Design a protein around this ligand. Structure first.
Ligand SMILES: *[C@@H]1O[C@H](CO)[C@@H](O[C@@H]2O[C@H](CO)[C@@H](O)[C@H](O)[C@H]2NC(C)=O)[C@H](O)[C@H]1NC(C)=O
Ligand SMILES: *[C@@H]1O[C@H](CO)[C@@H](O)[C@H](O)[C@H]1NC(C)=O
Ligand SMILES: *[C@@H]1O[C@H](CO)[C@@H](O)[C@H](O)[C@H]1NC(C)=O
Ligand SMILES: *[C@@H]1O[C@H](CO)[C@@H](O)[C@H](O)[C@H]1NC(C)=O
Ligand SMILES: N[C@@H](CCC(=O)O)C(=O)O
Ligand SMILES: N[C@@H](CCC(=O)O)C(=O)O
Lengths: 276, 269, 399, 264, 49
């Protein structure tokens, strides 16, 4: 972070008490992306810097912190003649006599352990893949959502065209039309209103078959919703290394990486992944 | 061998699929006997056969139809036992009938290479389209036993494997005939693995690859052993995984839109 | 090279009597004498560096027990033998520490090791679901709102053409209509109730489908945290005293004793002579927790026995150190050793080597009455609360 | 579902909710105790057995409060029942050769093949897999025909053999299946001694039969004969659905004498 | 899944005599419980749910 106006570090108290430890820091101003500038004070602090203060008071150090000139960690390569294979960035700076210790996230690697020596690690870490979460959508508007309007129109008119047949059948039986239509609409709706039953033997059969239609629809209709309100089948995980998409890019899963760094060396180390 | 790969095509099944036909139709006769025993019970204390079905069948489909009720005390215990499994049968019906309803159908278009639809492509509907690429072995084989075919696919002869695949999604041609190993690699590679071979990968002339040598050349004897040795050491078994691995596996939509509900209306038919 | 039998990395078996020598895919090793066959995980690596560097080795399975411990002047085990010029390397399950790294040297570690705690599986529990996990308490107050304001609407249109009888039918239709009913003959309300009736059909969808899965025991009932937990810090505490333990004369015991006094003193009476016997001392109920390495324990826990042995905190390790191979403190073999080791980690050699020697197997219940007994609690609560209002109302009317 | 404990509880529960309604009606500012049994059971089993609702203002809240347990009990019954039929899908299903189960020795299921077969030559070369068959060498049957019968009585569970023979057995016996994928591809072939004058003609005839469709007739006629190829439950479980109501049909015939005993 | 198991470290030049104590002091920080305080204060404290 940038310093104060006069050139001092703030006092950001932690939630649990004593404020964090801060040490002054020198380095580039505008990151020098082809536009280098002067060097100005900053505020370097955090977990790694907190470690350095612990080492300082146990074996009589006296330190001064200055960041790297460019930003790249370090990588050996040749420049301008294809015959000048040499380090760069922080790794190059250490071997140039401009520094004697490195305190930063540095991965122990065989290809770069010949020219330097490494102490025992702080932590233990691996390599993973970070991808944005998929958006979950729930169209729970109900109001007969899962059932399309195609079936709605015919089933709505199905009851009307079948109720009239009861009174029509009553003509030759060996209760008006309106007083008989309430029965069929009552059957489907699981209603408590019911009075009047067909008198002719055959009219009961029409009422009989209509009973089965009530059970199949509403019960099965409230079974389609059962899958609707859980579902939960998202499948967009690369699942580690050796993914078929990673083996052969499809110009749709675009992935980036830090230039120089170390994962670039690891990919160049092997041959089976020289296609992407 | 020789394979055929075509575009993926776009169901009454059983709207009453749960349980089975044999264990279900036998239930209906039991409705007769259970109602009959009530007649003997109703004879004592203070028509009946006809109303019994209404008195009884109206209970299995919940209870909405106006249903009467016999009087007495000992004449009503039996239906209480009937009401117990009245909710049991419905619960079983609504266990997973929705998942079985939307079950898809693995549709097919061609019986095989010798399918009779291939013999007379002009005998039905708009003519079928199927093509190969000549100057090879598949064209040679297809012209030695199916000479009637060869007068037809000469209409279409693509520039290569790449162009044919692109033209397949359009609709001008709906089939392909080429080397089996090459076609499998394309099919298990596209977007959503829509393109699928006929009959899930059926070959028709199992002839392998090889390394041509000069006649009588003495290198044949020991080169054969070297290839045979690698097969017992699992070399090409894992080597093929580096170059011949597919992307897809050859295996919501809360909609009904008739689907199989036509049978329910067919019942009312 | 001096090694020792460690279950995942070093397996020792007798030679085949029929052949009279060690079976293939192994290396010869002698006691101190009877010839034995030894193989495992640490052995496999040793072939690579020997091939890459080039030397001659002869395994020297150590008669002295354990891995190393200061006895106030002398050191036994692998470290002691190396400390007395009798062994250059001691490959095996050696934990890098602070005291040991003073008199000898170690290579670059290739496997993590720490401290973990293992406790048997615990029976799950389901809290009485508040209205069976519905649609928040808002909906329960919500239903009272429209239902009470829609009955008045029917009452208004009833007279135009009995409110007490107009609340029995209107409400009870929503809950699996079976109760006796009394329906009016008003045409205007007759159409109205059907629209209201159709709501009950859709209401069940809210109370069905969803409720099926979310009723079994949950919350994982996992309790008593790691070394930070005050359950360990207090020896006796509430309940019967805790039943942890560890193998003495190693690395974990020394770390616990020096760093955490008043703890190693108590568990001196809770010891285990070995490892395999210690596990049997845990399942039946005579012990509850174990304190050992994060490499031996993790392998067996993944292997498990009936899928009922897990580590508290799901693997919260402590005092993270690594493995390695000792040297002579001046052996000048360090540079060709560690550089060789780093190459395998750079490639996939060690990634699949763990699969060949470290792989587990495993890592829907009766509903009973205790979990969902809260549904009955509604009956008893509503039973007594009803008696006071109903019975006392007529007493005022009596006077 | 609900084990036993709730079911003697609900029967006790349905018993207790019957008595107090009559007591909550007699000393009230007009039914009988006979309505108690019909109303108590009537609400539960979605039936119209009951005649009428209580006519009071104290037990009115009881009926609604009682309606809830009718809903919840029938809700839970269907809720958990479909879970076992759908969600519960446990299986071991040993798959592939790369699985560590094959590498480590197994005592529950042993590994065996046919002695002096090509697999014996295979497993005895690669030192990497000379790990388990150096122990399961004691298990080597003398015929592939009888080894399948051994698996029939669940004696054997692992068998290494050619896929052509093994798969066709699944087509005949309707209770056997395979798993995984092939891991050693090598065809059959007519064999004869060196320098035999037929090493050139007979190979050509085999190839000429492949193109002319002869091998299609032979493969279909012999190998591919075709046979038998689950929400279809049968009398294994639901034969017990409809015998208690059938049992209750004959369980009330003696109750008529018990019922008619009140006449005299 | 993790596919490169290599830890961090402090780097310097070969000639440096600081090696003996820097490596020895790091290993003592692990055993002393110090590294847990830094881990819990500068890495894993926030929650999102
Ligand atoms: C590493 O630590 C050791 C232990 O203290 C140091 O050894 C002592 O160093 C001090 C000052 O350098 C001397 O006065 C002592 O005589 C040394 N020996 C003992 C036994 O204390 C050693 O110097 C440290 N290394 C570096 C590079 O500072
Ligand atoms: C650091 O140096 C000072 C004096 O130069 C003295 O305290 C001691 O030598 C060192 N402090 C330590 C080792 O704590
Ligand atoms: C195949 O041979 C024909 C001649 O028979 C020639 O016209 C053609 O260019 C060749 N190539 C293809 C792809 O057809
Ligand atoms: C091989 O086949 C040719 C085909 O006609 C025949 O002339 C020749 O005699 C055959 N050779 C033998 C050894 O059968
Ligand atoms: N694989 C075939 C391709 C040519 C063809 O289509 O016949 C061959 O090389 O003969
Ligand atoms: N083997 C490790 C842990 C201690 C033990 O296994 O007893 C060591 O040598 O320190």
């Amino acid at each position: 972070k940038p310093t104060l106006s006069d050139g001092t570090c703030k006092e950001e108290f932690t939630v649990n008490g004593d404020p964090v430890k801060k040490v002054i820091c020198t380095g580039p101003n505008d990151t020098s992306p082809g536009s280098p500038r002067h060097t100005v004070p900053q505020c370097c602090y955090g977990f790694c810097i907190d470690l350095l203060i612990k080492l300082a008071r146990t074996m009589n150090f006296t330190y001064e912190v200055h960041l790297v000139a460019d930003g790249k960690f370090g990588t050996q390569e040749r420049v301008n003649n294809s015959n000048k294979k040499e380090w760069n960035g922080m790794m190059g700076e250490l071997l140039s006599g401009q520094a004697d210790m490195i305190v930063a996230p540095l991965t122990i690697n065989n290809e770069r352990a010949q020219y330097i020596e490494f102490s025992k690690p702080f932590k233990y870490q691996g390599l993973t893949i970070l991808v944005k979460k998929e958006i979950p959508r729930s169209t729970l508007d109900s109001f007969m959502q899962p059932f399309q309007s195609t079936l709605w129109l015919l089933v709505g008119l199905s009851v009307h065209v079948v109720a009239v047949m009861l009174y029509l059948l009553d003509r030759f039986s060996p209760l008006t039309l309106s007083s008989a239509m309430w029965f069929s609409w009552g059957v489907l709706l699981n209603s408590g209103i019911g009075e009047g039953a067909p008198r002719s033997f055959s009219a009961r059969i029409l009422g009989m078959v209509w009973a089965g239609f009530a059970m199949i629809i509403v019960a099965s209709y409230t079974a389609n919703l059962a899958a609707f309100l859980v579902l939960d089948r998202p499948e967009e995980r690369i699942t580690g290394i050796n993914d078929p998409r990673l083996r052969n890019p499809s110009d749709k899963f675009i992935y980036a990486t830090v230039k120089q760094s170390s994962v670039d060396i690891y990919f160049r180390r092997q041959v089976e992944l020289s296609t992407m | 061998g020789i394979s055929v790969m075509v575009s993926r095509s776009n169901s009454p099944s059983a709207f009453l699929e749960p349980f089975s036909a044999d264990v279900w139709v036998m239930m209906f006769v039991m409705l007769l006997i259970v109602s009959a025993v009530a007649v003997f019970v109703f004879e004592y204390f203070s028509f009946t056969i006809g109303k019994a079905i209404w008195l009884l069948w109206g209970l299995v489909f919940n209870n909405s139809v106006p249903v009467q009720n016999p009087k007495g005390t000992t004449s009503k215990i039996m239906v209480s036992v009937w009401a117990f499994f009245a909710v049991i049968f419905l619960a079983s019906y609504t266990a997973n009938l929705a998942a079985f309803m939307i079950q898809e159908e693995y549709v097919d278009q061609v019986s095989g290479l010798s399918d009779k639809k291939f013999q007379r492509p002009n005998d039905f509907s708009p003519p079928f389209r199927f093509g190969t690429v000549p100057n090879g072995s598949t064209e040679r084989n297809i012209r030695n036993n199916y000479a009637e075919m060869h007068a037809y696919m000469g209409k279409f002869n693509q520039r290569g494997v790449d162009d044919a695949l692109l033209s397949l999604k359009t609709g001008k041609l709906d089939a392909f005939i080429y080397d089996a190993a090459v076609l499998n690699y394309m099919a298990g590679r596209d977007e959503g693995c829509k393109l699928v071979t006929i009959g899930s990968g059926k070959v028709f002339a199992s002839t392998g690859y090889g390394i041509a040598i000069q006649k009588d050349s003495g290198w044949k004897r020991q080169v054969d052993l070297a290839i045979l040795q690698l097969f017992g050491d699992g070399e090409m078994e894992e080597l093929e995984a580096l170059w011949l691995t597919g992307i897809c596996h050859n295996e919501m939509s809360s909609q009904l839109d008739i689907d199989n509900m036509a049978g329910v209306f067919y019942m009312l038919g | 090279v001096a090694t020792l039998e460690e279950r995942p990395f070093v397996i020792v078996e007798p030679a085949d009597p029929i052949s009279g020598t060690c079976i293939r895919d192994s290396v010869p090793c002698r006691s101190q004498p009877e010839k034995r066959c030894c193989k495992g995980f640490c052995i496999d690596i040793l072939k690579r560096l020997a091939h890459t560097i080039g030397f001659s080795y002869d395994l020297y399975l150590v008669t002295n027990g354990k891995h190393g411990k200061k006895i106030d002047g002398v050191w036994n085990g692998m470290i002691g033998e190396v400390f007395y010029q009798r062994a250059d390397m001691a490959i095996g399950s050696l934990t890098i520490n602070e005291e040991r790294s003073e008199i000898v040297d170690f290579s670059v570690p290739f496997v993590e090791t720490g401290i973990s705690v293992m406790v048997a599986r615990s029976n799950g529990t389901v809290s009485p679901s508040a209205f069976l996990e519905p649609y928040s308490p808002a909906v329960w107050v919500m239903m009272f709102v429209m239902c009470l304001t829609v009955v008045a609407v029917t009452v208004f249109i009833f007279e135009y053409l009995t409110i007490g009888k107009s609340i029995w039918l209107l409400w009870a239709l929503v809950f699996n209509n079976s109760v006796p009913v009394e329906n009016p003959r008003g045409t205007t309300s007759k159409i109205m109730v059907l629209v209201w009736a159709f709501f009950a059909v859709i209401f069940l969808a809210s109370y069905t489908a969803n409720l099926a899965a979310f009723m079994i025991q949950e919350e994982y009932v996992d309790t008593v945290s790691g070394l930070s937990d005050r359950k360990f810090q207090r020896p006796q505490e509430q309940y019967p005293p805790l039943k942890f333990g560890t193998v003495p004369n190693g690395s974990t015991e020394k770390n616990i004793r020096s760093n955490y006094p008043d703890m190693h003193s108590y568990m001196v009476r809770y010891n285990q002579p070995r490892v395999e016997e210690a596990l049997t001392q845990l399942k039946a109920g005579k012990l509850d927790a174990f304190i050992y390495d994060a490499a031996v324990l993790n392998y067996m826990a993944r292997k498990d026995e009936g899928c009922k042995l897990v580590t508290i905190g799901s693997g919260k390790v402590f005092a993270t150190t690594g493995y390695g191979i000792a040297l002579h403190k001046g052996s000048r073999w360090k540079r060709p050793i560690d550089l060789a080791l780093l190459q395998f980690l750079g490639d996939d050699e060690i990634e699949m080597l763990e699969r060949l020697w470290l792989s587990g197997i495993c890592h829907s219940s009766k509903l009973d009455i205790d979990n969902m007994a809260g549904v009955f609690y509604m009956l008893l609560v509503a039973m007594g609360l009803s008696l006071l209002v109903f019975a006392w109302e007529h007493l005022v009317y009596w006077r | 579902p609900f084990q036993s404990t709730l079911w003697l509880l609900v029967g006790l529960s349905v018993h207790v909710v019957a008595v107090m309604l009559y007591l909550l009606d007699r000393f009230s500012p007009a039914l009988t105790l006979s309505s108690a049994m019909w109303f108590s059971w009537g609400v539960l089993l979605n039936s119209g057995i009951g005649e009428g609702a209580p006519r009071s203002f104290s037990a009115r809240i009881l009926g609604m409060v009682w309606a809830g347990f009718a809903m919840i009990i029938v809700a839970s019954y269907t809720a958990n029942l479909a879970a076992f039929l759908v969600l519960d899908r446990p299986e071991e299903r040993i798959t592939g050769i790369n699985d560590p189960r094959l590498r480590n020795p197994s005592d529950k299921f042993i590994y065996a093949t046919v002695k002096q077969s090509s697999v014996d030559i295979y497993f005895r070369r690669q030192v990497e897999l000379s790990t388990m068959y150096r122990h399961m060498e004691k298990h080597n049957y003398e015929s592939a025909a009888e080894a399948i019968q051994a698996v029939r009585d669940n004696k054997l569970h692992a068998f290494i053999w050619d896929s052509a023979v093994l798969e066709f057995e699944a087509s005949q016996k309707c209770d056997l299946v395979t798993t995984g994928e092939l891991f050693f591809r090598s065809g059959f072939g007519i064999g004869m001694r060196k320098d035999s004058p037929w090493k050139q003609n007979v190979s050509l005839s085999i190839l000429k039969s492949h193109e002319n469709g002869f091998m299609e007739d032979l493969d279909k006629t012999w190998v591919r004969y075709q046979e038998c190829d689950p929400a279809t439950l049968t009398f294994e479980n639901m034969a017990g659905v409809f015998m208690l109501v059938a049992g209750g049909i004959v369980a009330g015939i003696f109750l008529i004498f018990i019922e008619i005993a009140y006449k005299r």
